[PDB]
Design a protein around this ligand. Sequence first.
Ligand code: A1L37
Ligand code: A1L37
Ligand code: A1L37
Ligand code: A1L37
Lengths: 116, 116, 116, 116
Amino acid sequence: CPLMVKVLDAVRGSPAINVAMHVFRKAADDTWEPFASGKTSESGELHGLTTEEEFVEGIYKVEIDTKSYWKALGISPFHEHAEVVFTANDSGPRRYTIAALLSPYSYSTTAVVTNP
Amino acid sequence: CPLMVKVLDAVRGSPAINVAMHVFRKAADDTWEPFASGKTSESGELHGLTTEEEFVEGIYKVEIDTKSYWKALGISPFHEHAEVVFTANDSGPRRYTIAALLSPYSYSTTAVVTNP
Amino acid sequence: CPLMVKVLDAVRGSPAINVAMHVFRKAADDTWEPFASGKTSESGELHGLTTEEEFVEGIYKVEIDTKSYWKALGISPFHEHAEVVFTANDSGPRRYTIAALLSPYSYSTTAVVTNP
Amino acid sequence: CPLMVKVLDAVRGSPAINVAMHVFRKAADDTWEPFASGKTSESGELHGLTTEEEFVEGIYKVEIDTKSYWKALGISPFHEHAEVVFTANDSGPRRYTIAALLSPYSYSTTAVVTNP
Ligand SMILES: N#Cc1cc(I)c(O)c(I)c1
Ligand SMILES: N#Cc1cc(I)c(O)c(I)c1
Ligand SMILES: N#Cc1cc(I)c(O)c(I)c1
Ligand SMILES: N#Cc1cc(I)c(O)c(I)c1
C-alpha cells in the first residue's frame, strides 16, 4: 500500500466516511488517464488504491469528491472537489499518505512521504 | 473586485510574492477554457482578474504554480500546483476572495464570499 | 498598525465578526499580564490593539474566544478558545498580522511579520 | 488510550518526531495543574498519556513544544508552542485524537472525537 488517503471532517470532528475519490495519472500525451478510485472507510481512510508494482513514477491527481459529502449533510459547500496533484517516485519508490481536512469553505491537504 | 486571490507563505511568515496562476472556466464539453491569469503582488494579492459583467455562472479552476515558488527558494515541494475548483455566480454575482496558505508539503485554501 | 488580528469562518466562507479576544504579555514571574483586547469588525479584523512604542520585546498570548462565536451559531465546538503565543519585537519593532481560520473542530493560525 | 496526539511536519512531509508536549488540567481554583506529558514517537504519535480511569471531565490544555522542534532544525519559528484547550468528556467518556500540522509561521490543530 504505497498510497493512502485520509479525510477528516473539521465541522463534526470525525473521520469523513464514504468520501469518493478518483485518481488520475498524466499520460505521455499530457492528458489525465484513469488510475484508481475508491471511497473512505469508517476510519476516514482509503487503503489499497494501488500496488508497489503499478505505482510507477508519474504525475498523479487525486480528486476528492468533497461536494457530495457536504451536500449529503445539507451543506452547500464552496469547492467542487479537493484536488491533490503531485509527482510521485521521482527518486525511487516512496510511500505516500495524503490527508485532507475538510470544512465547507476551506480545506487543507498535507502529504507524509516515507522511504520504505 | 469580483475575484481576488491572496497567497501566504507559512514557512517565512510573509506574503507569497510573484506567485503565478491561471484561471480557467469549464466548457460545455468539460474541457478547461482559459479565463484569466496573473501573479501576486508584493502584498501576496492578485487583483483585477475579471469584471462583474464577465464573471458569470460556471465552474472555475484556479491553478496556482506553487512548485515554482518553492523551487525558487531552493525547496523541493510536494505539489505540482495548488488547484481551487468551485462554482461561482450560480445565484448571480458575488465577490470572491480565495486565500491559499502555502507550505512545502501542505497547503490550505479558503474562500470568503460576499454579496455586493 | 503593529499588531492586527484577522479571523475567518471556514464553515460559512465569511469574516468572523464580533469575535472577542484578549492579549496578554508574560511577566517576569511567568504570569500573564493584561495587555490589550477587542473584538473583530465586520471585516473580521481587529486593529488598534497597541502602538509601536508600547509593543516591545516579550512573549505575547492572544486568547481568541472561538467558543462563544460557535455557540452563537448553535454549534458546539471543540476548543475553549484559540491561543496564539509568540515572542514579538526581540529584534526591535516589527508589524504582526495574526490570522485565524476557524472551524468547529479545527483551527489554523498563521503570522505575517513585516519589517517597518 | 482515550487521548492521542499526532504531530506532522508540513515543511518536510514527515511525522514530527521527538516533539515534547505537556498536558494540564484546570483545577477547582481555576489554575492549571499538571496532568501528563510525553514526546512523539517515530510515527509522530504520542500514545499512553492517560487512562480511561484518570481522564475525567475537565478543561485540558495540551502545550506542544513546537519552538524546540524548529530550532533543532535551524529554523527560528513564530510560535512559542502550539496550544490546544478543550473541555473533555462533558457528555460521558470519549476518545480524542488531536492532530497538529506544523510550519514555522503557521499551525493547524484538529480533533477527532469518537464514542467508544
Ligand atoms: N481504475 C480505475 C478508475 C479510475 C478513475 I479516474 C475512475 O474515475 C474510476 I470510477 C476508476
Ligand atoms: N491534517 C491532518 C492529519 C490528521 C491525522 I489523525 C493524520 O493521521 C494525518 I497523516 C493528517
Ligand atoms: N489564513 C489566512 C489569511 C491571512 C490573511 I493576512 C488574509 O488576508 C486572508 I483573506 C487569510
Ligand atoms: N504527570 C505529569 C506531568 C505534567 C506536566 I504539565 C509536565 O510538564 C510534566 I514534565 C509531567
